[PDB]
Write a protein that binds this ligand. Structure first.
Ligand SMILES: CCCCCCCCCCCCC/C=C\[C@H](O)[C@H](N)CO
Ligand SMILES: *C(=O)CCCCCCCCCCCCC
Ligand SMILES: *C(=O)CCCCCCCCCCCCC
Ligand SMILES: *C(=O)CCCCCCCCCCCCC
Lengths: 235, 283, 268, 60, 5, 235, 60, 235, 60, 5, 5
């Protein structure tokens, strides 16, 4: 026969391999495809869809509908945060379960720009200006508008365009970040503040909710496929 | 266009000299090495040089598999105070010393990594008994994926992690991995910290190890015997060999001169005397 | 040159600052690469960079140290040594990311009757060894980063035996280059020697070097400057000579990304 | 019947190619080519009847 | 014979 | 299937082999290189850089900074050696730890020309002439200037050019030498002598150091890769 | 898709060649070609700003 | 993978095989050849060089210098043999240790013409005619000149041309002979006789030696390589 | 990169050929071709300074 | 098809 | 491609 010499790797089974193998049902008449709507070609397409953030994971609000609602009110102006969030899209508990967070938990590395969009759900009569902030890592995380203003931000004026978007631009030392909590590849701080205050007339609710959404920009990518911690099978 | 296997330069014949040209005199303060060749300070003949530097190209210098770890597993009955032994290893070249010293001639590197697995087993108890041929699962779990807690738990399902199922007594297992670094090159040395200590924060909260970057840099290999246990005990070891293929390196460094002492550049007291006695005027 | 130009006589001008020297031994450009701004094809953070240009790329003089017969050597880290230098330091602490090259000019004059030789080495990623044999990689951020005062080498390793309150500092032994490798080989790093009979300064032009295009200047030092007496100071027959050594360093082509509020580090 | 395609080369030591021959009659036996296409996310990200211009008011 | 991609 | 016959070598693992093997991370998005300064293409590039010789390995000077300093003084002319060294670049204790020596200890064989450069570190006021010698092997190793002069040598005049280089030309019977102490492939003798004497005026140090450096010429090469004895791992 | 290169022949018994076909899509799976380049040592051996002429005084 | 079927011979090690195998020292810098004199391309070149025959293997002469000397004397003419030899170049004890005999003992089969050359070592004053004979096999081996003359022969006249050659032409039934004593492939009889007598004047030695040499002609070949019995290694 | 040579055929049942491809970069890994040359024995059998004519007296 | 180096 | 001997 043709002289051959068996190399290392011979007879192993690598679950990531890509070889040919014999067909157990030869000449099978395959059913043709039909043009079903909603075909997906790449998981990042799903990461670019806005999904809603469970911002308020307090002991009584978590795992209920309330976790998605961020309560605002018409109280006097303060420089104190409405919310504070770490830019760790796969590991921060508020981001890890969003569709983006979920897909990122099947990969080791992520890179690219993200965007946060907030929806005001108070009455038409309610007005207000808010400041949405992104502080790249390395300094004290912002707890006052004074610090948050110095970073990347959008001052949102509430009105007919119900929603506002802040883009978190890819600003990183490394070319990809890890999808776990890691200081070396930390992403920084997302926060929201009152710029002026929510103002309402009489006969109007004085408290209301905003909802927030996160999605990936067209420059966003992931790599090194891995199993997720978000599902298990005990026994 | 000069290749690694090209012959080095010929020696050109040179005769006596008496001039203001002074090749022999120099000044090392400048930071430069004097580029001399024999014909600059002695009379030479013409020689057609055939030797080449082919074996000392960066690729050729590294073109060898080196052992980076030995993992131990067993196939024993799990019992209330002791479970069947599976192994977990943090991927690194710093648990052994030889490949580590070679890579550390340089500050940074890029390479594709070839891993080869040699697997050996033995009986540990006296009894006669037997075991049937073992199959091993070598699962890569990258930073963030669930590390196995028991030899038989759900994580060994590997829907996304790469696993090798190796059959005992067959050729040593082998896979390749691309350049997987999150930087443009691997850093053999990182003069920094992964955290900035802030004043407004407790010291504990800002603390981090010197020279360490990502806590789980590359993840782990988890290895198990897939077979159920035998009445007789069998212990196995998986030796891992790493070869850097398609390699590039930057910024040369003096090699390690005293024994390694941990993953950093630290040294141990009592090991700091590499050099031996030899008299100045003794050949 | 027949117009008089000399290898030994140089003038360097960056920003509002000029250095002159009349006893140079040429000057070094590390790895033959002059500093450069980050190219679009190698760029990584997408936000508009700041480039302070003359406000930061100018010569800053650090505190002068003193060379004596008992001196074992000195070290500094970049950018750490410049963290408090004018607008360079400000730009560094206001931004997550920053990159920079440097012109390093070490100054040390004496006389035709003095002798001695300083090895001046620029080391990429100059990781130094710690004082501990109970815990490795334990040097604290505060001790790893002295700022402009720098640190020193020692001829003796001495392990910290206080386990209750560890010193957590480096213990860099001179013949082991403070890092477990032999000093005689440090010449593979970009260097010059100040040999007092020949020259009174060293000049090293350092490119930004890293495994990344840009990084955290506050967390990471790219270059280390190590100055060691290769031949000890000596003068006439005085038992206790002294001559000063001054470090002047200028950032070059520095740019910064990721602007936020200022970093306020725990330095003590 | 050999199919010759190019590799996208990551770490380096011209175009490097690789060869593939199908050994079986059934396409189901073939390896995966990994030569896949991308599409725009619009059917999920902008399923609105009137085309969205991002600089304009989304509601007019 | 051969196909090129 | 295609008739094949398995040859010797089949299923072995040679650590020096060079085969293809399956990729465990298919379609991984590799980070591109950037143009980092200081790229090296061949280990002999490092061997061509001058590194400093630990000449004085006396019991009290070895493993200290003093080992690199060769002391001279203004004493009356003598024909006795300042230093004596064997040309065994991988095995003589003074050369084996230089960068050249270290790289040679990863190879079995070396060939080519070398060069020694000495740096005078006395004061500007100090003058002197020294004789630097290379004696090819086979005769009595030189212990007096009389013998050393008869071999390859450079008479060094101390002055503004601070340093002087002697090239040790490739002069060997064999085409490559062994990187261990071996009589058959011995390289001969390096030595330094006072040609006149060091002279100083008054008010000047009467003793000073010279430093020495070794590096490879462009005709230098090594082969047969091997492990070094210069590092170990007990337990 | 075969790549044909020449061997540098050491001991002898024309150009002798050898053949190589890449079997995999990922360049990381390829063997090493060993067809490497050399460069001049200058960035380490002569990193000085002013070009060194070896016959001339290094200090002028 | 490519469908293959392992054939007989698989995994065996044939010491005479000729396969490729991996190189343990990749990219090794080989030392070039130089043009050393005396290169040999084929073992039959050595068989064509004349080497001296140990004709006289008597109990006292064997394993001494005397075994190479065939003594003649000026005695009256006789028809009795000076020497008798079997043409069994690998197995007759007088031929088996010659260079030809030795090379033939690494092969099973030999074929072709041979030649015997005799050198007269008496004084210039000694004269004589001798008859050198080759009798192809199958009859009574010659013990008298009468029979020897009837076969292939040369009548040698002693004189200034010191030596004489008899060619033993390839005359065989089989196409190759065995390199052992074998009747079926026997080669016949070599013998030497006095044709007239050795004559000397007075004041001259009356006895002298002749030396004999054997070598192969250009039509000589061997085949089927084998181990020799001419060397062993007990324990 | 295939090398096609002819066999010298001994027992028979045109030119029959065989094929050879070198699989490795190092010539040392190659099989032996057995395509060898012969030379004349003269350097050993007739090393004399003056060319020998066999029909003539070797000593004149 | 083939490439030659 | 091919060589013929
Ligand atoms: C089925 C088995 C798959 C095994 C996959 C292993 C993938 C992870 C490879 C990590 C690469 C490690 C390279 C070496 C170490 C680093 O270069 C140094 N600490 C410098 O950063
Ligand atoms: C197209 O394939 C023509 C070229 C053929 C090249 C060699 C094929 C190698 C062996 C193929 C076996 C096919 C499996 C049934
Ligand atoms: C270029 O490759 C065209 C020539 C094909 C020659 C024969 C190929 C031998 C078998 C290749 C199998 C490929 C592995 C997936
Ligand atoms: C020259 O070789 C071009 C023709 C290629 C013919 C098919 C090659 C068969 C498989 C070769 C594998 C090479 C081993 C590295």
């Amino acid at each position: 026969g043709l002289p051959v010499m068996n190399t290392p790797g011979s007879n192993q089974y690598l679950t990531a391999d890509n070889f040919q193998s014999p067909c157990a049902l030869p000449e099978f008449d395959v059913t043709p495809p039909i043009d079903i709507p909603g075909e997906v070609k790449n998981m990042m397409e799903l990461a670019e869809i806005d999904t809603m953030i469970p911002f308020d994971l307090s002991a009584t609000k978590k795992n209920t509908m309330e976790m998605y609602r961020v309560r605002l009110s018409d109280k006097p102006h303060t420089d104190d945060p409405i919310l504070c969030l770490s830019l760790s899209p796969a590991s921060d508990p508020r981001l890890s379960h969003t569709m983006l967070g979920e897909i990122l938990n099947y990969y080791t590395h992520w890179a690219g720009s993200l965007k946060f969009t907030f929806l005001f759900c108070g009455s038409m009569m309610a007005t207000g200006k808010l400041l949405v902030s992104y502080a790249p890592p390395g300094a004290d995380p912002p707890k006052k508008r004074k610090e948050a203003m110095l970073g990347t931000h959008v001052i949102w004026d509430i009105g007919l365009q119900s929603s506002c978007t802040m883009v978190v631009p890819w600003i990183s030392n490394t070319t990809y970040r890890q999808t776990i909590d890691d200081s070396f590849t930390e992403g920084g701080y997302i926060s929201v503040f009152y710029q002026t205050r929510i103002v309402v007339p009489l006969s109007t609710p004085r408290e209301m909710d905003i909802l927030g959404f996160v999605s990936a920009c067209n420059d966003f990518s992931v790599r090194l496929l891995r199993d997720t911690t978000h599902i298990e099978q005990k026994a | 266009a000069a290749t690694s296997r090209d012959a080095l330069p010929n020696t050109e014949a040179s005769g006596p000299t008496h001039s203001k040209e002074i090749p022999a005199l120099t000044a090392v303060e400048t930071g430069a090495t004097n580029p001399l060749v024999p014909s600059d300070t002695v009379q030479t003949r013409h020689v057609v040089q055939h030797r080449s530097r082919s074996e000392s190209s960066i690729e050729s210098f590294f073109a060898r598999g080196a052992c980076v770890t030995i993992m131990t597993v067993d196939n024993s009955a799990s019992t209330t105070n002791k479970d069947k032994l599976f192994a977990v290893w943090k991927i690194t070249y710093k648990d052994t010393v030889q490949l580590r010293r070679k890579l550390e001639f340089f500050t940074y590197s890029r390479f594709d990594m070839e891993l080869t697995f040699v697997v050996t087993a033995n009986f540990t108890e006296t009894n006669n008994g037997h075991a049937l041929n073992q199959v091993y699962q070598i699962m890569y779990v990258p930073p963030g994926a669930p590390v196995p807690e028991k030899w038989d738990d759900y994580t060994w399902q590997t829907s996304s992690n790469p696993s090798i199922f190796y059959t005992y007594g067959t050729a040593p297992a082998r896979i390749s991995v691309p350049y997987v670094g999150i930087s443009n090159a691997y850093s053999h040395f990182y003069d920094g910290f992964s955290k900035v200590p802030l004043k407004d924060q407790s010291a504990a909260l800002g603390d981090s190890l010197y020279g360490a970057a990502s806590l789980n840099d590359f993840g782990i290999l988890a290895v198990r015997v897939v077979n159920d246990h035998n009445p007789t005990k069998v212990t196995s070891k998986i030796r891992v060999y790493l070869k850097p293929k398609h390699i590039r390196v930057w910024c040369p460094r003096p090699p390690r001169a005293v024994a390694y002492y941990g993953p950093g550049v630290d040294y141990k007291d009592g090991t700091l005397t590499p050099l031996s006695t030899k008299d100045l005027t003794t050949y | 040159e027949a117009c008089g130009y000399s290898d030994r006589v140089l003038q360097l001008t960056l920003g509002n600052s000029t250095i002159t020297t009349q006893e140079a031994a040429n000057s070094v450009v590390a790895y033959g690469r002059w500093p450069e701004y980050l190219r679009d094809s190698e760029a990584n953070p997408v936000d508009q960079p700041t480039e302070p240009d003359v406000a930061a790329c100018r010569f800053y003089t650090l505190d002068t140290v003193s060379w004596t017969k008992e001196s074992r050597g000195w070290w500094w880290k970049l950018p750490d040594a410049l963290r408090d230098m004018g607008l360079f330091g400000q730009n560094m602490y206001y931004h997550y990311l920053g990159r920079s090259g440097y012109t390093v000019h070490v100054q040390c004059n004496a006389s035709k009757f003095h002798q001695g030789a300083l090895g001046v080495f620029a080391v990429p990623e100059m990781c130094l060894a710690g004082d501990s044999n109970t815990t490795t990689m334990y040097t604290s951020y505060q001790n790893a980063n002295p700022g402009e005062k720098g640190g020193t080498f020692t001829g003796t390793f001495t392990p910290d035996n206080n386990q209750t309150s560890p010193a957590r500092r480096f213990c860099p032994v001179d013949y082991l280059l403070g890092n477990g490798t032999l000093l005689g080989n440090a010449f593979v790093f970009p260097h010059q020697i100040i040999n007092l009979r020949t020259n009174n300064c060293a000049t090293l032009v350092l490119p930004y070097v890293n495994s990344l295009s840009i990084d955290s200047m506050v967390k990471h030092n790219n270059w280390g400057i190590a100055i060691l007496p290769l031949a000890p100071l000596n003068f006439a027959s005085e038992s206790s000579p002294e001559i000063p050594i001054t470090l002047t360093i200028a950032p070059m082509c520095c740019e910064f990304n990721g602007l936020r509020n200022i970093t306020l580090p725990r330095l003590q | 019947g050999a199919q010759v395609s190019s590799q996208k080369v990551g770490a380096h030591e011209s175009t490097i190619n690789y060869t593939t021959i199908n050994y079986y009659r059934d396409s189901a036996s073939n390896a995966a080519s990994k030569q896949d296409f991308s599409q725009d996310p619009s059917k999920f990200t902008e399923p609105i009847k009137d085309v969205l211009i991002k600089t304009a008011p989304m509601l007019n | 014979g051969s196909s090129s991609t």
